[PDB]
C-alpha cells in the first residue's frame, strides 16, 4: 500500500491482501480429515461446509455451518488437509 511491485509480490502481501485482488484468484478454504470415536471413523470434510454431514456407519453429528468456517461438534479429533 506504500508502494510495491506488481510483478512478483511479496508472500506476506499475497496472504494479507484480498484473495480476489491478488495475482491469481484462488481459494482459502481447505479440507479436514476428521475421526469420530463412535466407530473410530475417518471422513473428508470441507472447511466451509454447507450441510450437516453425518458419518457413514454411526449417526453422529459432525458440524453445523456457522457463517464462514464451521465449528466441529464436541468430541471429534480433526486434522488439516
Amino acid at each position: 500500500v506504500l508502494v510495491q511491485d506488481l510483478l512478483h509480490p511479496t508472500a506476506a502481501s499475497e496472504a494479507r491482501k484480498h484473495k480476489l485482488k491478488t495475482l491469481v484468484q484462488g481459494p482459502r478454504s481447505y479440507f479436514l480429515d476428521v475421526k469420530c470415536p463412535g466407530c473410530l471413523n475417518i471422513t473428508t470434510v470441507f472447511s466451509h461446509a454447507q450441510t450437516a454431514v453425518t458419518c457413514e456407519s454411526c449417526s453422529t453429528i459432525l458440524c453445523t455451518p456457522t457463517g464462514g468456517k464451521a465449528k466441529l461438534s464436541e468430541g471429534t479429533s480433526f486434522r488439516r488437509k
Binding site: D5, L6, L7, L23, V24, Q25
Partner: protein, 129 residues
C-alpha cells in the same frame, strides 16, 4: 458499462501515466492489445510489459518511463487507402513527422510507416503520440 476493452485498457494506461506512476494494472488482456503494446514497445513509447496468466483472461503489467503524451483509439474502424493515410495522418496527429497511426491490414497490426513500406492499407485502430 463495458465500453470496449481497447478503450478500457488505453484509458487505464494513459490515466496512470498522466498522473505519473510507473507500473499499471491492465486487466483483462487481448491479442489486439498485445500487438498494440508490442508496436508501442518497438517504437519505445513504454518500457517493458508482461502478460500474467490466470487462464480466464490474463492480466497485463507495464513498466513505462514518461513518454506517453497522448494516445487513443478511434471508434468507427473505417477504410483507408494510402493517400487517405497521408490526409488522415496530417489531420489527426499533432504535426507532420510526429507520432504514429496504427492499421489493421491483410498483414495484421502495424503502423502507417511500415504499412506504406510494405504497400498495404486497411482498417484503422487508433493513434500513438
Amino acid at each position: 458499462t463495458r465500453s470496449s476493452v481497447l478503450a478500457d485498457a488505453l484509458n487505464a494506461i494513459n490515466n496512470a501515466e498522466k498522473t505519473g506512476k510507473r507500473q499499471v494494472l491492465i486487466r483483462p488482456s487481448s491479442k489486439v492489445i498485445i500487438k498494440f503494446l508490442q508496436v508501442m514497445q518497438k517504437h519505445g513509447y513504454i518500457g517493458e510489459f508482461e502478460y500474467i496468466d490466470d487462464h480466464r483472461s490474463g492480466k497485463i503489467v507495464v513498466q513505462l518511463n514518461g513518454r506517453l503524451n497522448k494516445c487513443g483509439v478511434i471508434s468507427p474502424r473505417f477504410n483507408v487507402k494510402i493517400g487517405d493515410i497521408e490526409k488522415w495522418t496530417a489531420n489527426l496527429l499533432p504535426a507532420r513527422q510526429f507520432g504514429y497511426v496504427i492499421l489493421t491490414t491483410s498483414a495484421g497490426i502495424m503502423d502507417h510507416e511500415e504499412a506504406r513500406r510494405k504497400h498495404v492499407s486497411g482498417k484503422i485502430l487508433g493513434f500513438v503520440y
